[PDB]
């Protein structure tokens, strides 16, 4: 099972709105303590569980809806439901066991996901906006479902979500 | 039976020989692409990587446009479906690679191709990239961008559950006859010398679907793939002049209402999907914006026989307000 979505056609405020969407998600979870912009999360999932597959049905549906023609300004609103609707699998999975790691933890996780995504078992769910500048040279929204190698360092659990915030 | 006539073929040859501007971000030229060239070079370069391709086809509005100009659905976007059993070996990635190395060759002369990575081509010209390998579905997508609105989508489909919505978007027109014509003859296309091209429909018979597109008839099958947009899609045809055929829209016209309420339970949710739909489909068209909300109004009212008014009354009011706010401006 593989689902991968990339979009390089976001507007500056589409990015800026999603960044606010992700930031409230960071504030709502417990916080742990022990150029380019990147913000998002990497959620580990188990596909033999009802919760694992019930999430995929919503994730797969969101990507299908993102594949529509004039569906660009709706990205900010469709994501508002997606990750904040606790009456739904993905919005509920992000309210439970969401953890905020410092950037020294997040950068290794981002970089391995960037490696695992480039070259053709643990099901990972990621949503990742990114900006490259001052000005804005490119804005990218990547989000997908992949089965790969360990990005977590045994430090993450199943249905545990890890926050990404790189600046 | 399925063979396009000299008019329909002329329409097809025109849109596949158009030169479409494919704009690039930052320090990158604009790409001028002929859809027929994309089909050739992609299929040849794919073949050089021992990746097979069954056929190449045209989809949605452009297909409906070649069969009937007057339908009004319009030729706005070009959608090219490459039907290929991409079974294993990460063939979905080599497809991604081949398309990117075709984008490199289409570049204008005078570019130092050595600094151009595949990734820089991606970030320059690509607008969307989607890959789906879940259950029965195996398919990929590379949406090329154009600043002027046109959208040149390249779809690579092994298997896809639902390939249509209504009868008038179901047509798919094979292109292999047309491409072989250009290689074989130096002579141009005439009313007697034109290729034999076969139209097909992913919903039942081509003759049934063609008569619906010609008489402006809203018909569909397998409504279990309906969505909240299904109701909205239904009205978009109805206001463009399309009409139902009077054959048990009873459960259907309730399902679209039923599925639109479920998908959009909040009053705020409904007002945002409606406001978005109006501007993303009828920009500047405030006469068609009004007439849309009026058709959507009447459909929801007469079709939703649902006894409960929590969804009906509040939904019905959002349509009335927006119809007035559109009118009074």
Residue numbers in the entry:
A (entry chain B): 57 to 90, 121 to 206, 214 to 226, 289 to 322
B (entry chain A): 63 to 391
What did the study's authors say about this model?
The strand at the outer edge of the active site cleft of FAM46A (residues 189 to 196) packs against strand β1 in BCCIPα in an antiparallel fashion, integrating the β sheets in the two proteins into one extended β sheet. Strand β1 in BCCIPα and the edge β strand in FAM46A form seven backbone hydrogen bonds to join the β sheets in the two proteins together. However, CPB1 of Plk4 leaves the active site in FAM46C unoccupied, and its binding does not affect the PAP activity of FAM46 (5). Lys155 at the tip of the loop between helices B and C in BCCIPα sticks deep into the active site and makes a direct interaction with the catalytic residues Asp141 and Glu215. To accommodate BCCIPα, the C-terminal lobe of FAM46 rotates away substantially from the N-terminal lobe and creates a larger opening, as shown by a comparison of the complex structure with FAM46C in the apo-state.
Here, we report that the nuclear protein BCCIPα, but not the alternatively spliced isoform BCCIPβ, binds FAM46 and inhibits their PAP activity. Unexpectedly, our structures of the FAM46A/BCCIPα and FAM46C/BCCIPα complexes show that, despite sharing most of the sequence and differing only at the C-terminal portion, BCCIPα adopts a unique structure completely different from BCCIPβ. A helix-loop-helix segment in BCCIPα inserts into the active site cleft of FAM46, thereby inhibiting the PAP activity.
